[PDB]
Amino acid sequence: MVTTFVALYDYESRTETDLSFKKGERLQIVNNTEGDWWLAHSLSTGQTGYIPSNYVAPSDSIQAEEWYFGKITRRESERLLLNAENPRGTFLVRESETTKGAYCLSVSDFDNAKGLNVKHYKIRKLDSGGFYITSRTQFNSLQQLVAYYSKHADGLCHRLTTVCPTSKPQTQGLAKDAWEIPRESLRLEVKLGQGCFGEVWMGTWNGTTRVAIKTLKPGTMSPEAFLQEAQVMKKLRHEKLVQLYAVVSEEPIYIVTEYMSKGSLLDFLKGETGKYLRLPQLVDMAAQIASGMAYVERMNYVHRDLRAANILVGENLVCKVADFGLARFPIKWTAPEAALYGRFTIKSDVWSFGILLTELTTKGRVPYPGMVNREVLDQVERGYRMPCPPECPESLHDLMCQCWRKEPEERPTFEYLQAFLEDYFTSTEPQYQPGENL
């Protein structure tokens, strides 16, 4: 039939042909084919229009439930669950990444020895159609398991109390078929930064939506070579990359992306924000950046300008790779063969990541302290490399030295760097609570 969907978040209208809704509103949708915007009809308000498809789930599905987070990893479930204000027994249900087919109940806990921690309980999918954590207490569905452990601890660490708070996500695109937008639809209001290609502003699209807008001085790039680059970038879709929403293509080129108010990593390492970062948090930020770049690597594309100034920070120490060097002077981050011969590859990005690692372990200090752009290039071509920073572990510097091999083909992959940094204090995230309480 017409499928009835339930809204998972509020959504405010942006254009003349999309549809406002509130969390829990049921919407009829006839063609729910894979896509980013669907045509909906509300049976509450009678109103019609396009809605972002990641804001709804089929009524009566496990995806319609507030506590089902789906394809989130153990890392990222712990990022949300370890938010220090939410009480003992805050929880979510997700898929297991250790064992295919199986689910996982992740619950915040607290102990006098270990403090605030997260416990993970394997939810067995009985091959005949049931669910359990222990085989003495079985359930027909995940929602009966959760209804149950909300009243009874019964071998869990805590009774399930509060549904894990998440933030309402981005839509994919600003609107159904919005890409090349008119300059009039953008209001540049607040200055975020200035660069060697353009300015970065905070503004609004259509009066309604917060966006970030990056401008590029005319002459940087012919709009055609730019537009070809921007649609490659538009195809990229990852939790650890900033989304490119829209573009003003004529000259002066605008690039419209997701605004992130906490700002750059570079500014975040410094001062009041960066005085609460310890090694564990800095290694966590590096691992997220490596995740984003591992996707870029998988997608056979290139950043060309990776550094802490081009990483943006979100809630719970989220880091996203931003400002792709689509128009490619940060010579201190540029691989020798990239600066000398114009050879920008995923391998020159690996070099830049090594330089970004010294920024993360030095509270944001500038690379090659006391060298100028010309000095660095000639010193680096001689084989010079920054020494291990004070307060940086020798094994993180060993990682930097692998990133800084002279030959691009001896530099490791972003898959390797992600694995290394996710495993650093030992982890692909393997620890489940056994079945042996009351």
UniProtKB/Swiss-Prot annotation:
EC number(s) per entry: 2.7.10.2
Residue stretches making up the SH3 domain: 2-61
Recorded GO MF terms: ATP binding; ATPase binding; BMP receptor binding; cadherin binding; connexin binding; enzyme binding; ephrin receptor binding; heme binding
Miscellaneous: May be involved in blister formation in Pemphigus vulgaris, phosphorylated-SRC is abundant at blister sites but not in normally adherent tissue, which corresponds with loss and disruption of CDH1 in cells adjacent to blisters. Phosphorylated SRC is increasingly abundant at pre-lesional sites of blister formation and occurs prior to changes in abundance of CDH1 and DSG3.
Family, similarity comment: Belongs to the protein kinase superfamily. Tyr protein kinase family. SRC subfamily.
Domain notes: The SH2 and SH3 domains are important for the intramolecular and intermolecular interactions that regulate catalytic activity, localization, and substrate recruitment.
Protein name: Proto-oncogene tyrosine-protein kinase Src
Gene responsible for this protein: SRC
Included stretch of the parent chain: 86 to 536 of 536
